[PDB]
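pasting input
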Amino acid sequence: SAHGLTDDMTMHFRMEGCVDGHKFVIEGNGNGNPFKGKQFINLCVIEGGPLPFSEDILSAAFNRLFTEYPEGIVDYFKNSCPAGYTWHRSFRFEDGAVCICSADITVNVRENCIYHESTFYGVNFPADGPVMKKMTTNWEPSCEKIIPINSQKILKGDVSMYLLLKDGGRYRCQFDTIYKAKTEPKEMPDWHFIQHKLNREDRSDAKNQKWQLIEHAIASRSALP
Amino acid sequence: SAHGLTDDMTMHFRMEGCVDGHKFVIEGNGNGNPFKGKQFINLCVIEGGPLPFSEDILSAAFNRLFTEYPEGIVDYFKNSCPAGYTWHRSFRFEDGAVCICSADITVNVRENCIYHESTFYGVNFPADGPVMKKMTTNWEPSCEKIIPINSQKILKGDVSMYLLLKDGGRYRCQFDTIYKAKTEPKEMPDWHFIQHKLNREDRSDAKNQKWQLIEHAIASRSALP
Amino acid sequence: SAHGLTDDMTMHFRMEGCVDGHKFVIEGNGNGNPFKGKQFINLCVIEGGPLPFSEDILSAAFNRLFTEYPEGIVDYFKNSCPAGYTWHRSFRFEDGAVCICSADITVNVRENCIYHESTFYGVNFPADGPVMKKMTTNWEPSCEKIIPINSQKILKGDVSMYLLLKDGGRYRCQFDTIYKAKTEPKEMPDWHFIQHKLNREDRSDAKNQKWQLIEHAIASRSALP
Amino acid sequence: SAHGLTDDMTMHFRMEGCVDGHKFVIEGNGNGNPFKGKQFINLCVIEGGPLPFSEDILSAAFNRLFTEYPEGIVDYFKNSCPAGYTWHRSFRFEDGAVCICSADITVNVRENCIYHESTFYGVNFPADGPVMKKMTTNWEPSCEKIIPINSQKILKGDVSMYLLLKDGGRYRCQFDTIYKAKTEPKEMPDWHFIQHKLNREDRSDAKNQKWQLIEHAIASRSALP
C-alpha cells in the first residue's frame, strides 16, 4: 500500500479532556477516503456526559490525512504515513474563552485503520455565552493558510473560524496550529490553503450523548493566475 | 452604463498619512477592469519622501469595485455605484505595530474615472523591525472572509495577511475591515470569500519615490460541495 | 524652575482627529503642578461637535510631565524639559475598534506654560456598542508598567484599561505606548509603575460640547519589600 | 484559626501537565502565613524530568489564600476557607504559545495545612524561543487587577506578565483568570489590585529537577487619593 493508506479506511478515536473543571472521555469510530479528503466520524461521550458545554467546540480535534491534495503541492501528512503525525492547537474565542488540543495520528496498516488519540482542555467560557447556553449549530466553511517552517520541518496553520448560532449570529475563534510529522520529511511543501467543510448531526438518545461529524477538505494554491 | 462602470476605467488617488510622526502625501493614477477584478496603480510620494518605512504597509489601502463577482453572490460594491462606498480598517502587526486606514471611493461617470481618497496612520514600528529596515518585498496571496452585518447593511472583512521578507521570512498582519455603501443597499450578500493577489514593483528614480501596484481579486463561496 | 517647569503652570491643547470618517478638532487649556503629577484640563469641541462617539475614548491623549516621580526612580519626562517629548499609542478595544494617537509636548519657559498638540484616529466602533451609544462614564484607576528600551533611549508603556459604562459594564482597552524625549537622555530609568486616576466632568451647554478632565499620576516601584 | 487558617501553615502540592506532548508530574510542599500573603513552595519534578521547557512557565499555578488583604477590601479567598476555591487561567505568550491551568485548593483544618491540586497544559512553544531554550530567569513583579462578577459571585483577574530572560529581554504573557469560591460568597469585594512578587531559586541536582518558589502578594486600592 502507498504509505499504508487505502481509499476506504476505518478510524478509532479516543479523546480525554476537561473544560472549566468538567472532565470527560469520548470514544468513537469512523470511515473515510483520505484521497478524496472525506471522513465520517461517530462519537459517543463515555465519561462526563451529558456535556455542559456545546459539543461543537470539540469538532476540529477529530486528521489532515483526510485532505485531498493536488500533485503540485507536497502532501506532508500522507508522506508521514504510516507512522503518522502529531499536532497542537490553540482555540481563542472572541469572548475570552481559550481551548488547547493536541492529537496523535497513527496508521495501523494491517487493520486498514487510523488510530487517533487526543486531549482537549478549555477555560473561561462565560456562563451566559453561546457555548454554555448551547446556542451553536455548526462551524462555517473555512480557508486555512498552511505555512512551512523549513528549519524545523514542521507546518503552521492559521484559520479564523466562526461557529454559527441558533439566533442567526456568529462566534469567532482563531485557530493557531503546529503540525509535526513523526518521520523526518524528505520534502517540504510550499505555503498553501486548505478549505474545509465540517458538519455535526446530533444522534443522542435517552441513554447516550452521541453525534456524527462529516468533514471534507481540499488543498489548493491561489485562485489568481 | 450599469452603475456607471465600464471594463476599462481610470482612477485618481490621493492619500494623506503619518507613521510614527512622519507625515506624507501620495498621489497617483491607474487603470483597471472592475468586471475582471484587475487594476494597475501608479503612485508617487509627493510630500514626505523618501519614506523611512517600507512602502508595502500601504498597499492594501489602494477598492473592492475591482473584484470579479460571480452572479450567485450579491456584489455589494458595484451595487453601491456610482455613489461609491467607504471603508475603515485596522492593521495589527505581530511585533506590535498598529496601523489604521480609511478610504472613500466615488465613481465619476462622465470621466469614466474612479476617485479614491484615503488616510493612513501607523504607530510603533520597531526600529529593528522589517518595516523600518525595509526588509519587505510583497504581500502573499490571501483569502479574505466577507461577512454581512444585516442589521446595519454593512460588511465585515477578516484576513490574516503576511508580508514576505528579503531573507525568506514572513511578517504577519491581521486586517479587520468594515465596508459601507454610500447608497442604502437593496440586497445584501451572504458570507463569501475574496481571494487576492497584490504585487509591488518599485519605479523610483533620483527625483521621486514611485511604484506600481497590481491587484487581482475574485469572490467565491466554499470550494467544497 | 527646574528644566523650565514650575509647580503652577498652564497648558494649551489642540487635538485634530477622525473616528470612522467623522472629523473633529478640540481646543482647550489647563493648569497643574507637574511635581505633584496633578492637572486640570478644560476642553472644547470647536469642530465636528457634538461628537457621535463617546468623548471618553480621547481622554488619555491629553502628558507624562504630570507625574509625581520619587527621588529613586529616574524621571524621563521632566528631564527632557523644556524641549519636551513625543509619544505614540495604540489600543484595541475588546469589540474590535482600534484607535491610535500621538502627541507633542513642548515647554514654553517664557510664558511658564506647556503646548500640547495631538492627533487621534480610530476605526470600527460598532453602531450598537457603548462608544457610539455614548454610554460611558469614566476610565477606572490603573497601574501602567513603564519599561526602558535602553538601546534606543525610549520607553514602552503597557496598561490594561477599563472604561466604565453607565449600565454597569466595563469596556476593555489595551494601551501600548512608546515614549520619546526630544532631548537625548543621559540617564534612563529602570522599569517602574505609574498609577493613574483620570476623571471626566461634563460641562456641555447649548452652544458647545465641553468638559473638564482631572488627572493624578504617581510613579512607583513594587509594593512588596 | 479564622476560616480554619493559621499564620504558620504547610501545603501539599501536586501538578500533572503536558506541554507540546511532553507529560510531567510535580510533587512539592510548602510553608507560609496567608495573613501576610507570603509563602515558600518546594517543588520537584518526579516524572517527565528534566523538563524540556522552562519551569518558569509553571510558577503562577502554585493560591490567593496567600494574599495580605487590608480591612477595607473584602477577602474573597479566605472567606471560602476552609472549603477552598478553584481557578481557571489562560495566557497567550507573545510568540503564540498558549497555556491553560486550573487548580483546586482545599484547607485541611485537622492538620493545619493546605492541599493544592493543579493541571497545566500548553502548546506551540517555538523550538528556538526562550522557553524551549530554557533561557528564563524570573517573572517581574506585577500588579493584577481583580474585578468582581456579581451576578455569578466569581472574580476575574487581569495581569500583564513579563518573564525576564537570561539574555536581557522580556517575554510577555497575558494572564486571564476566573476565581471561584467552593463555598457561596455572602459578600463580594469591589475591584482592587493585587501586587505580586514571585521568585524561583533552582535547587536541582544529579537526581532531580527541583526548585523553590517564594511569593509575596498584597491587595490594595488605588495609590491616588
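fyi Chain B has one helix and twelve strands.
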